[PDB]
């Protein structure tokens, strides 16, 4: 078939991290998914932002869950020409009329523990704005995968970090997925190879990748024939795939 392309945070290295501009630009592009992360605010809002704090990519400091949607909207995103962080409702508006689908990540808080009651709130929100039926859900945490398995019929994918992959080893990663009724894993592109993909598929699991940001990495994913990869350079990915097909 054809390896799908997911725009990492709207295309971080083209448009900045999680910017209205990058999401808008991604919404009009010739790829299949946009990838993004969500966190709650202290007053029940759902904001699109990678880290659980605002420090790294904005001019404001603090944990998103400790602050109001008001304060979060006062923050300005680095390299985002004046942009503020998006709510989920706002993000949904840009994609309702687009052909590109959602790949949502359930990230934990600053303490690394999952947000209590949030998976439900995200599922409600997406249903309320007519995108749930176009969302694939992802997380590094089995606690979050387990909540998703119980709360939704949408596709679920487990993000397997290099540490987990190396330490558990592929055998145990596969056993753990199967034990949790997880039908797809995503590994860091630098930890992927043909043998690993063989082993994963032989167990009945889909195999995708993440962090394919360079020409080398992007080409590796296409040559390997993975199901999907996230990329901070979606423009180049599309161009490299189009050219890979023909070659
Ligand atoms: Fe993510």
From TrEMBL:
Domain of life: Bacteria
GO process terms (BP): lipid metabolic process
CDD domains listed in its UniProt record: GDPD_pAtGDE_like (cd08565)
Binding, Fe(3+): 35, 37, 105
Protein name per Swiss-Prot or TrEMBL: Glycerophosphoryl diester phosphodiesterase
Gene from which this protein is expressed: glpQ
Classification via SUPFAM superfamilies: PLC-like phosphodiesterases (SSF51695)
Organism: Agrobacterium fabrum (strain C58 / ATCC 33970) (Agrobacterium tumefaciens (strain C58))
A GO term, aspect molecular function: phosphoric diester hydrolase activity
Keyword Metal-binding attributed: yes
Keywords of this entry: Metal-binding, Plasmid
Keyword Glycoprotein: no
InterPro entries assigned to the protein according to its UniProt record, in alphabetical order: GP_PDE_dom (IPR030395), PLC-like_Pdiesterase_TIM-brl (IPR017946)
GP-PDE domain location: 3-241
One Pfam family of this chain: GDPD
Upper lineage: Bacteria, Pseudomonadati, Pseudomonadota, Alphaproteobacteria, Hyphomicrobiales
Chain sites annotated for binding Mg(2+): 35, 37, 105
């Amino acid at each position: 078939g054809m390896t799908r392309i997911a725009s990492h945070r709207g295309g971080t290295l083209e448009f900045g991290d999680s910017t209205p501009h990058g999401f808008t630009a991604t919404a009009a592009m010739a790829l299949e998914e946009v990838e993004f992360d969500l966190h709650p605010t202290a007053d029940g809002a759902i904001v699109v932002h990678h880290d659980p704090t605002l420090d790294a990519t904005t001019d404001m400091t603090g944990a998103i869950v400790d602050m109001t949607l008001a304060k979060v909207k006062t923050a300005t995103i680095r390299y985002g020409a004046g942009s503020h962080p998006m709510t989920l409702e706002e993000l949904c508006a840009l994609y309702v009329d687009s052909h590109v689908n959602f790949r949502c990540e359930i990230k934990p808080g600053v303490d690394g523990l999952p947000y209590e009651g949030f998976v439900a709130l995200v599922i409600a929100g997406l249903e309320r704005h007519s995108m749930l039926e176009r969302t694939t859900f992802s997380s590094f945490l089995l606690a979050s995968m387990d909540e998703l398995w119980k709360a939704t019929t949408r596709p679920r994918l487990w993000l397997v970090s290099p540490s987990v992959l190396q330490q558990l080893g592929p055998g145990a990663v596969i056993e753990t997925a199967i034990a949790h009724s997880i039908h797809e894993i995503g590994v860091h592109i630098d930890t992927a190879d043909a043998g690993l993909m063989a082993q994963v598929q032989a167990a009945g699991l889909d195999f995708g990748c993440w962090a394919a940001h360079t020409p080398s990495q992007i080409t590796k994913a296409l040559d390997l024939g993975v199901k999907v990869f996230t990329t901070d350079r979606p423009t180049l990915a599309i161009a490299l795939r189009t050219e890979h097909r023909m070659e």
